[model samples]
Target: KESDRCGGCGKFTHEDDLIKPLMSKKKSHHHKKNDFQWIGCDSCQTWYHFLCSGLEQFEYYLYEKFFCPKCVPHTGHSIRYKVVAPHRYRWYSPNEKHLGIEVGSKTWIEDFITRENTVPSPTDDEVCIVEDGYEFRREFEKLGGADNWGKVFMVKDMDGLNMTMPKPGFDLEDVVKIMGSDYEVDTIDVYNQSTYSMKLDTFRKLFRDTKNRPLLYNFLSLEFSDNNEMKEIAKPPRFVQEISMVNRLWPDVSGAEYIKLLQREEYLPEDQRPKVEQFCLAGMAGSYTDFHVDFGGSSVYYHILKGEKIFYIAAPTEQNFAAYQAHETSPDTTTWFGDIANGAVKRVVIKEGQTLLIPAGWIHAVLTPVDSLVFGGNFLHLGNLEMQMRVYHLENAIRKEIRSEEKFYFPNFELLHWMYMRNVLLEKITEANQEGSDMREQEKNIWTASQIMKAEMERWMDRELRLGPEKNAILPTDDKNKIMISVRKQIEIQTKIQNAKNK
Candidate 1:
């Protein structure tokens, strides 16, 4: 029934819909003799109105392939034989008010350099969904309202699902023996056990429970929330032998598949299955995921079974992270804020039944609206070495630009990467001035020739940095203060050590 319209653009199908109409609608101006050949090609099965095909692009395509111009380019890459389902990537209509916000021509790195002195706020539009049953009030009550409300907010009342017992077939002791003594415990909350039982009964009544009902036992609690206290109750005991076993059987139902995915790999040869160290499962009412980088050698994935989560990620950049460290709490600020948000430039809102893949060391945070359960884990794989190498090159390039005494440099790194990671380089170069020919020469040499040419094409970026609104432009005053406050303190500390060595 939906066949007539081009699948590329969801619209009604009709021959005229695909063909262009007359150029002039006025009766006096319109010519009665219309010369055009319109037909679908027998070989490629594309409908092209002859007159319209005279356009440069259409004519070009007709000379080579009789295929529809739209379908020809993608024909090579599209998988024709695979019986894959239509992609189910989540989709959203941007909020009406947020539409038409200019996607700044400045790259992400450029924005980071200029944004340092200003307060951090949402740059991209986002929709925050509250988890069911976990109201913001509950967050306040459970966490003692940000102050010290001493009574640790309790996890939603959990019953019917035994908090202390392991699933019927699993042995908690055997699991502990497999996992080391130093392993961290992961908790799972089980709520609304009656509904689970009813679902089981309904399945049994309908089809004698042909599906793996036993698999349901592995799920932990129905849902969880952000109460720091409640999350504690969900952790696996530290002494477990096989950590995956406990997680597989958590009272929370959402995690069962993740457990299977992990355990199935465990049976493979050591070289085949990677070593897993951490498991992260989060879903609860009104709980927002904190922004922070994952520990090194860690990989994370999440699947939302119900409700939705809004996720954010910011690539680390010299300028952005300098702004970040100014406010970060731990010595390993990158990892310490394991779930804290910083320089958040990319935001994604995932609806129910969507999955999120997060590579290691990337800073990420998420917000869940309504009761939800997501399951995924972290492990080290040999491939991680390659990934680490890429990140290393990226950081090295950024620092080189910031630390260099150059006045100007052509953008050399890939534009995508530059947008995400080279804010520091932009800041340093922008702060330097005219008459610094030697520095400019050094700067030009630092970038590759190809990149230099592309950078030249984007002269508008230079003009913008030199002259734009104060808020949107980089200023020398801020850089001077930063040099004085942040850089001077480091220099002073280093000087003190050197003096002490002489003494």
Candidate 2:
């Protein structure tokens, strides 16, 4: 029955059962009549069943571009229709030259991490001891947390934060042993712009044999949280709990809470939810991921548990975002965006035991300068709701143009956004109800934060609703009803706060 669904016919008719062949009768004779598999052409966007098209199924993935007979002649004119050759690594810059664009002084990164940047501590005039969640919250309110979400900072210790996870200890060898050789893994041939699945043993062997060579292979999103063997050994990091936007309300929650919600069976029946809250990345020297924004406009954090990684970061400026999208959609993307970033890109080397926080919508690329193992995860939070919405719209536009699969997005992202909006509004209403004379200043800050969140939520909802019910599948009956109720309540609370302020 699954095979009956054809993109070309828009009906449940098999290739063999079809009234006529998709290709010419003369071309159809090249393949056996029994073949029923189909391949979609990247150029004209048509599906040709294998027997109809006289092409094998394996060749579909092999060629970067597969044009059907009708679209074949036009391939020479359109770069998107041409098959891409295998990728090769060339040093973007020499050892004497900097790998990334300069931000300020050449040694600016040396002073990037300091007492003023990493964490806030009590001074001679202050007597407060910032230890756990409550104390950190109090200090955060006093200090006014996160002036610029785009800036990067480092923390020496993971203590005095809400992030809850197992301490780092595992290595690549341990990972291989625990995950086992039989387990299948997805690998990216960076040079070829291709992804294929292979046994872990095969990848390990290739990596070992090509240690000094530039094979440009990378293993990404090797989630282990659901594996029976890896579940005991892998856990979320401490910084996961310390995210202020998420932790302000869900203080006692586990790091896996958001992911666990996404995994719920009721929302997406056919799609398999990703098991872990985090992903493991293993790469050899010369492995690189090109510049792009993260899926669904979510913020991301990376902790280097082993070896070193060089990251080239570009701010999500209006001009830079437009440039990134233009380059990505351009047929030939071999040219790196960082080279033409015009000094907007910052180069930072993440060594072992260091954590790098990237806010939502920042464009970045990663280069593994040596064999390395990295742990990182993406998150959606309230702090940068406006920017996240912008990123999501851009992602939708790009994915539609490229005809990318649904898997390209974060699972249940829209559902999570609606839920997050509801929870934030409810939390604000509760805070407003408990406001007292002694807590007037704190209450005022809470009201201002809530007002900003409300405005962003309403704006995002308007845009999403404009897409219409058919296009937006996430806003189904239950979620939509909940959002409406929350919005009404939030409006009432906002009115009460405004009246108090006027008095």
Candidate 3:
């Protein structure tokens, strides 16, 4: 019975039975009764009728799959489709975020002893200790050179200078040739920088003119090489190509859910909404980003179109706060993330086709693994209310610091004098208050400082601005229902946690 049946498209039936036919050479004599044919598969050795096999016999039979009804495996039986290529191509895609994440502590650095292409060793004249290091893996004993070495916190091997061949459509030779030895350096020195830590309201009032343009900070650059000359040479063409790609990929999220979330307010045209997107095409040669976080209330995504980078992330807890605050006080302070002497911290290496997702309130720093083209932007996302709250708190903290100084030293001349003494006085004041009562006048100053701190704390807890009629009352009621459903689903999860705690 099985022999009488022919197999094709994984089906067996009489009509699909194998058959043989006679060969005819007469001109235009196509359908000879004896011309029916059946042939065995080269690999499976199963006979198949010419019609059932989905193949034309006279034409060349290229090596391809020939399977019958019973021959296909059942366990893996599922419809499979070919993968569609991405509409836009770049060095990075959205999914390749998991490349390398290792805890790079000071101890990790000590294990490598070889000096082959190793970062320069720390010297007595060094300003800080090694916080983190990159690709040159020879773990030297002590990396030192700058003064105040002990104060140095984080150090990493910088990997952003990775220069390699270009992608298929791009020309590496042309890029390098254009970036020949005529590059110039751009330097920004915040000499005697005076930072006022104040709430958004007070800070905005100081610079409140509506006509004033928003401050623009170039956070990153995509470049061709480490050689200054080559970067200048490739700058023009590279910039042109980069801008084209940026416009294609970034667009506002539009969908039914988004519309529902904005139910009450009229949606603005795509061009009209408050927008914050940044793009760059510059080389990272001798340049390095100082440790900091992007402004709060923003979600940032970075794509490495070419080259590589080592990114470090730290939460804004006590340990990280101390380090960042230290650096904020004095640029010369060696407050870094990878300092093993300080503590263990996690670091991730990002390459082409990879992305790093940084949520609001997370502090991040970047080190170029090679001279690379990095694309990044920050935008509003789902948690707008929570994000705005965080920004308000940060603004308030900055303002309190500035106003506290003003309260103690009122005169403009004295304010300038205090500004010079800002960092030193702050450290002294913070230390004195924490250690308990001092002189009567010292206690009075500390009392005022304590009141300012309390006020800031209360401001942080208050969310009156965020829970206005617009977001809480007017925004989609259906979205709120969806949130309630999610909460209900998570109830069992909380119950299990409670049970575990009881046990």
Candidate 4:
């Protein structure tokens, strides 16, 4: 009787409803008769009544491989597997013609070059513009040290900086040899933004085979250090080291040192920790990473080792955040943000040997105009700690309301935050007690650490209060109490440091 029921509507039918008997009534009068005209899916093998599924018996015979509605979203064999008009979905570049625009007929290249030449140089009035590391540092100090936080900048003449790598550069052939063919890597189908894992050799072959076809595939954000194969061969650029002071307070903490900390195993289990470093991106022309915020509100620094990348940057203004939220949640995310509501989108190009810094919580996407090899890493630092925390909270809020899968964040992000808070507070306490310490330096250190601790403590309390008894079940009340105690002790230290400075 259960077998006779329709899987879709779950209803049984009488003999009159049967289109064909169960076994053609066999050869005898006692042969069993079926009650419903139902068809089972060839793939799922679930029976559906013809009337319930709205499929005529004749239509069911038309296909060699039939599937139910539930299975239709998959079955990658469909003719329309390719996404429609991917170029229109991305921000337009003056250098390149829009999708379907004829190349020779238009003067797009000339117009782009003219526009580039006419653009003004960095000026003193604009604090965001800096010519080199020395200028950036000088401007940062001149503006009371917080002016550069959460702002994007264009840095020119970084050639003299020590951030350049020596031998065995990150060219495609060198990377393939360093990473080896056996190492597995993640490849993204840019059109649908779907990801799948494949062997490095397999991906290399695919990359070679599809060199002329740009928008179809991309090897996105391959972390060579994740495999431990390229650590000795590859190194972080000098710009990263120059900005090291921003995270100097918690030097040993995973957020401080760019490459080493990302490889730290404090938060993640040993097996999962290796893949945390900044990635090496090898993208073919027309490959795109759709609009997204970096994982865990972490600030990112990218040095274009080869080729060029165009970024469509949108600051995390309240209105812009809302626009991004709506766009991300919309049925069609492939539509470019420029076409959406007013979000103040700005386009910048990161050419070869130039470095770009994207501050925390900035919503942005990258477009590869040609084959590119770029080195970039993300970090949580004191420069914009509060903003980072805010972005983390926003991520959670979106997680609850938005039904789609969220972007990958730093593994055990909150746990690392707690760890960093504990380490920095202890470091400040020790620094305040040091002999012959400059009062100014001690006061600055303590005050910054206090602010970070206070913010983290508030977040902890909020989370704990929300979860009640459940919070302890997740992260133990005893551990949280220790962190709170540490915060209180650090606040006392901060007060002493300030009092000494005033005297």
Candidate 5:
């Protein structure tokens, strides 16, 4: 049935609805000139409609060996085609040009440069701009310390922020010295909108070459925290150190660390624990990153090591979220998200030595105003628990529609949530469930969080059990049962406490 359905676009045919062949029709749809047509790929063997395959009425007859566009990357184009050179540019006919504006043209980039100039920047009321690091913590806490600090904010300099950065004039040569020349790193082909692996040495040559290059290095993980001196180079902000779930986790009872606890107890295999680390990103001038919320709805900390960055940000509202879902699902990357009813979008420039913190669920896009390097990381915490959970569910619903190479998922998402519930929330809730007790200062910390923790987790655990191996393999049955029984009991206790207030 799947083999009979169209493989391209939003099709009228579905695999489940293949009833025409169950009882063969007297007439077939694949017949005359005015009728619809179905053709099969010689290589992949999938069926596609002639119209959907971009074929003229007679074009199907011309190919001796037909291969679909999806198969072209692996099969290396149809053998029937003349040469590989011209056919490779099918998406963008380079020389013929699209509307007299050739891609990679100087005029188009001038418009791209103008994009930042035209977009309005955030105001004092909209975004909190901190000129002094001494005043940061106080101002940040006032705006919404933990629970959904729904606004974006930035710190101008390291003056009193107590943060560390690579020494002034830290260049590409230093990276090679530290990471070693042979180290393979991730590189983004900006025009192609794809990521591929390239050696650190190879990328540096491209960075230094005079010819224009469209590459971004945003996945440089910092696991070399030993004698590499990198760990000392860009120490995170004090507040980040304080609130980061990884670091803030208390030992023994209340907070169990991810790396050690999971491995020591054999909860997760050594390799299974997610390596969520900060990335040192390098972007050349003219490179642009499209809109996305950070993986797992975790808050992000970005510090510019050198050069400049232009950020276009939007808030997390139901209207904005709905618009974003369409922007992703409609599958159009050309239309700027700001072009929609995106009155909420704000533009700002983050310069060298400045740090910017994007709270959970904020939608953002970035442009390299000039050649820039930035250090950024993502973290989930107790503060914005609801947004994190909301984002995880939202991502799950939309994730399947996206192609694997195109999708950006938070590493070990479900595992992290389960860990938090069992290791962190389980301990805290049981403490609160104590008889004849009022909510303590620490008890109120995860109080509001308990509602959502108990609400969705039941369904998540059951789905895991139903799905079998891949899902059930993550947690033991005993752990799941204990976590559920614990949260459910706490919610009842939490409710009784809430009602006893007599408000």
Candidate 6:
């Protein structure tokens, strides 16, 4: 009674039922073997293979409503959904990560969590722990700020940050309520080491059924700021608002969010701003992320609403970065990056109610110790401009190795920098050149923030003098030599302004 399988042969189900049936040896001489993946027509409820139906195997998810050859005369073309995100990693091979099997699979995480827990705990000497009365900017500047960056601060209590969250018990279920059950999101199948778009119905179901079907379902990039209500559910730390360039580009009103200027121009292919700033990093326990730098070398802030994350971070030293560069493309990258970096790595377990602000360009990994509801975001700011570009160059060198499916970069990264150069940096430099203009001190000493910014701008433009067409995406068609020279001149002006000025 339950014998109907594939439309090609209409037979019983077997282990290779999707592929092994009808070894059509002689007749299949011209038949394509690549078209063996399964598909089902909505109208007929008939299972079909790609070759039999004249479809592509890789474009399986494109068909929202597929019609078989028998039904296609009535239905016409298959209804397809827009391919907005990558569904999975394209390649498959096994190495040390899965004990010589596939990556991010069941066995890989089992062995990984065992090793993830064994790292040395971060000591106060390594990481500063602030229990209360945390002043974000003051503390950030105290640690030599982004100029001499690579400091990890563990804020045990967030009473001073004036942040908001869904009343303590807010979990993934609450998150699903924000984005309706039918609403789909991108998810990383940690076991499969691939990504897939799953509706909240399935996501919440899999999350609740952890005991029966435990999978490392990582919804790390659940950005909901675009949603009207979800926009205000949780706020980034006050420090992010204050120091982030996108929040308030300059100290004055003339400046605006870099993305705001982009919105004003309406030149981008899409309207959504780089909303990576507000994301609900919801993941199951035993979920693990390999060592990675945040996209665009942006600084990061994480506030755990619930559950715990065992964070392993490595400072961006030349030696450590070299090791990281190797591991990113290495076959045996399954070996912990910390082990590869030797003593450069440090582990910090951030529990519920705790927060972590990781500066730009630091390579880090995470092991979720519980089914966590974490709110975090990334931001590009005036500080750490040099390190940002340094990492950008390193990432550029490894661009060939990075797959499209990976989240190694921020959205509109190049465009953001371009907009900054046009809207912020030029105006900033022009104002500093005025007779009455007096730029404020950035860190109370050394160079003015504007001066440092222009210096970095000069360096960046000098490098941009060598922009490759493939590398430059969505850059303004016009030349930025105007800002380029302005930046170059501003550097000389600031040097003499400080070289002879008395306190």
Query: Which numbered prediction scores highest in TM-score against the true structure?
Result: 6
After TM-score superposition, what is the CA distance of residue 206 in candidate 1 from its true location, in Å?
Answer: 31
- State which candidate has the highest lDDT: 6
The segments of candidate 3 whose C-alpha lies over 4 angstroms from its true place after superposition are 1-265, 269-272, 330-341, 383-388, 399-503
Count of steric clashes across candidates, in order:
49, 8, 62, 1, 0, 2
lDDT by residue for model 3 (164-230), tens? 2233334323432444322221211111011111222222232224254121111222222234444
Q: Candidate 1: which stretches are off by over 4 Å?
A: 1-282, 318-326, 330-344, 382-503
RMSD of each: 26.2, 12.4, 29.4, 13.5, 11.9, 10.5
Question: For model 6, where is the 10-residue window of minimal lDDT?
Answer: 20-29
- In model 4, the number of clashes is 1
For candidate 5, lDDT tens digit of each residue in 269-346? Answer: 433344444567777777767788777788887888888888888877778888887777774534667778458788
Off by over 4 Å in 2: 1-143, 146-148, 155-169, 211-214, 228-239, 242-276, 434-467, 470-474, 477-482, 501-503
Please give the ranking of all candidate structures by TM-score, highest first, separated by commas.
Answer: 6, 5, 4, 2, 3, 1
C-alpha lDDT of candidate 2 relative to the true structure: 0.54
Q: Which stretches of candidate 6 lie over 4 Å from their true place?
A: 1-45, 48-103, 123-125, 133-138, 144-149, 249-272, 401-407, 436-472, 489-503
Q: Lowest-lDDT window of 10 residues in candidate 4?
A: 22-31
lDDT of 4 by residue, 385-421 (tens): 7677777767777777776432565554555555556
Return the TM-score for candidate 4, rounded to 2 decimals. Answer: 0.66
Tens-digit per-residue lDDT, 108-212, candidate 1: 113322533243433322212233223424443444331222111112222211223222333233233433333222221111111111121222232223342
lDDT of every model, 2 decimals = 0.32, 0.54, 0.34, 0.56, 0.63, 0.65
lDDT score of residue 372 within candidate 2: 79
Task: Sort every candidate by lDDT, greatest first.
Answer: 6, 5, 4, 2, 3, 1
The CA lDDT at 12 in model 3 is: 51
- Candidate 2 clash pair list: 87-191, 87-192, 162-241, 162-242, 163-238, 163-241, 163-242, 165-236
